[PDB]
Amino acid sequence: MTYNELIYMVLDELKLSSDDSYYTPDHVIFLLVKYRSFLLKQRYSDIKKQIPDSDYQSICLDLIEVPAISGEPCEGSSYLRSKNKVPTTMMIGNPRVYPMDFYQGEITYISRDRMRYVGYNKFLRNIIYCSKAPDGYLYFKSWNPQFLHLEKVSFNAIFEDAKEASEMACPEENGTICKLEDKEFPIEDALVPPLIELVVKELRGPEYSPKDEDNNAKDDLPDAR
Amino acid sequence: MTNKEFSDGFSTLLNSFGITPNITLDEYEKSTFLTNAQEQLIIDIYSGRNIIYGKSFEQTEEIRRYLSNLVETYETSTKVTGKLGLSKDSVFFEIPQDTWFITYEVAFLKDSRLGCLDGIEASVVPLPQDDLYRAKDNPFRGPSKDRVLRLDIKSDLAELISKYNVDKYLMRYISQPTPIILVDLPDGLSINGVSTESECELNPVVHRAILERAVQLAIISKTQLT
């Protein structure tokens, strides 16, 4: 299913058909994307369960060498990092950066705190480690100077905001999909009715609520105007 | 009832030339009131706003038997070329121009994109202009292989918004009924553009109701200032 199908299921269950509606499809996209993460956390944070392939998304990154702090000689070894800021992953699935082949390569996505200290083990000096810095970028670290030649990677994870990760998908075979509405929404079909009814309950009450509808330099809501 | 019988019964119900005070109408006046009663009654019956029947266009056998003889089917393949629509994929079809209310309306599609489903009969959905923008992108209520949106526009036209090419346009509507003209009217006079005699095409069941309504309209016309 696509963003369009879910959006219009919500709009039609609310019957927000007219162009002169207070609640536009943008409200629906926002609520759907937030309730997706809400449900995914409620389902897959208590105890460890199998996560379906539907919850995952591959964002698609270009890496650039950057200094550790600045261009100084003693500021430490340099890192690669993604050109653009990366979405925050949720901590429930199998995050993975891979070199355009999911079935190949060993690039490890770890925590920020762990990545301060990695690679000291002599047998772990050739492993590339990844983590999202507080800057918002995905940083890479390794003790093997070869890692600085890496140009492109794909990052597959259950990203915390589906819209951000959908804007950064890799090109499909046909080509890029400009409209987010034509892209696929990242959630399992078993969790679609819960998500829809939560969003419809969210917007049902506000749908029929009054407005400050007179232009009289006055607040008209206490009068149910 | 025939035209002679409309006139004789109309006179009998109005007590024309009886001893008591009464009302006498010319055959043109009779035709005017009969046609007005006919059109009022069938519009009220279609919309279901008649309190006596309280039923809509085909909601019971009675109303079916009443308005069965106005139901006309129409088919067209010609598209009006130069007109301004609300979408790139909008085609315009002329309306028969004797249409009163469109009751069934369906569209056959001829396009190679919908493979092995070619010639699919598609439901033409009348859509308001509020709903149009949010229905172009709608995958459940918008245009598709099995659904076409129809909008009314100027000059008796139907703008059909479809995703696939529209080949044929089928309709079934309620027609302008023939007026009830009891006499060959003189030069200049006519009812609904008809000067010669015109019999009611509906069934004789509703002719007596039309007569009653016409009599009441006549009494209203003569006794609205007294």
Q: Are B138 and B147 in contact (CB under 8 A)?
A: no
Nearest C-alpha in B relative to A182? B137
Cβ contact B134–A16 (<8 Å): yes
- List the structure tokens of B202: 């509906």
Q: Are A106 and A128 in contact (CB under 8 A)?
A: yes
Phi-psi sector, A13: left (phi>0), alpha (psi -120 to 50), beta: alpha
Q: Are B56 and B46 in contact (CB under 8 A)?
A: yes
Q: How many CB atoms lie within 10 A of CB A145?
A: 9
Strand order in the sheet with B121-126: B71-76, B166-175, B99-109, B121-126, B147-153, B157-161, B90-94
A185 secondary structure, DSSP code: P
Look at the block and give the residue holding tokens 């963003």. Answer: A3
Separation CA A12–CA A9 (nearest Å): 5
**Method underlying the structure:** cryo-EM
Size of interface A-B (CB pairs under 8 A): 32
Cβ contact A17–B139 (<8 Å): no
Q: How far is A35 from chain B (nearest CA, A)?
A: 22
A142 secondary structure, DSSP code: -
Q: For the packed helices B3-14 and B207-222, what is the interaxial angle rounded to 10 degrees?
A: 50
- List the structure tokens of A12: 């039609």
Separation CA A48–CA A112 (nearest Å): 22
The per-residue b/e assignment along B36-52, b for 16 or more CB within 10 angstroms, e otherwise, is bbbbebbeebbeeebee
Q: Are A179 and A68 in contact (CB under 8 A)?
A: no
Whether A19 and chain B come into contact, CB under 8 Å, resolves to yes
Q: Which residues pair with A79 in a beta bridge?
A: A66
Helix or strand holding residue B163 (H, E): none
Please, what is the end-to-end C-alpha distance for chain A in angstroms? 40
User: How many residues belong to chain A?
Assistant: 225
Cβ contact A4–B139 (<8 Å): yes
Cβ contact A12–B138 (<8 Å): yes
Nearest C-alpha in A relative to B142? A8
Q: Are B189 and B28 in contact (CB under 8 A)?
A: yes
Q: Nearest to residue A43, comparing CAs of A144, A157, A147, A192? A: A192
Set of chain A residues whose Cβ sits within 8 Å of the Cβ of B137: 4, 8, 181
- Nominal resolution (angstroms): 3.2
B interface mutation test: which of A19, A27, A178, A179 has the most B CBs within 10 A? A19
Q: Which residues pair with B172 in a beta bridge?
A: B73, B104
- List the structure tokens of B185: 């009217």
* Environment class of B30 (CB within 10 Å of its CB; exposed 0-12, middle 13-18, buried 19+): buried
Q: Are A111 and A98 in contact (CB under 8 A)?
A: no
Separation CA B13–CA B152 (nearest Å): 43
User: How many residues belong to chain B?
Assistant: 226
Q: What angle do CA B140, B146, B149 make, to 5 degrees?
A: 75
User: CB neighbours of B104 closer than 8 A, spacing ≥ 6?
Assistant: B170, B171, B172, B173
A145 secondary structure, DSSP code: G
Please tell me which of the candidates A5, A11, A19 has its beta carbon nearest to residue B133: A19
B interface mutation test: which of A10, A17, A185 has the most B CBs within 10 A? A17
Cβ contact A11–B130 (<8 Å): no
B191 secondary structure, DSSP code: B
Please tell me which of the candidates B128, B133, B139 has its beta carbon nearest to residue A5: B139
CA distances (Å), origin B85, targets B41, B127, B152, B193: 36, 14, 11, 33
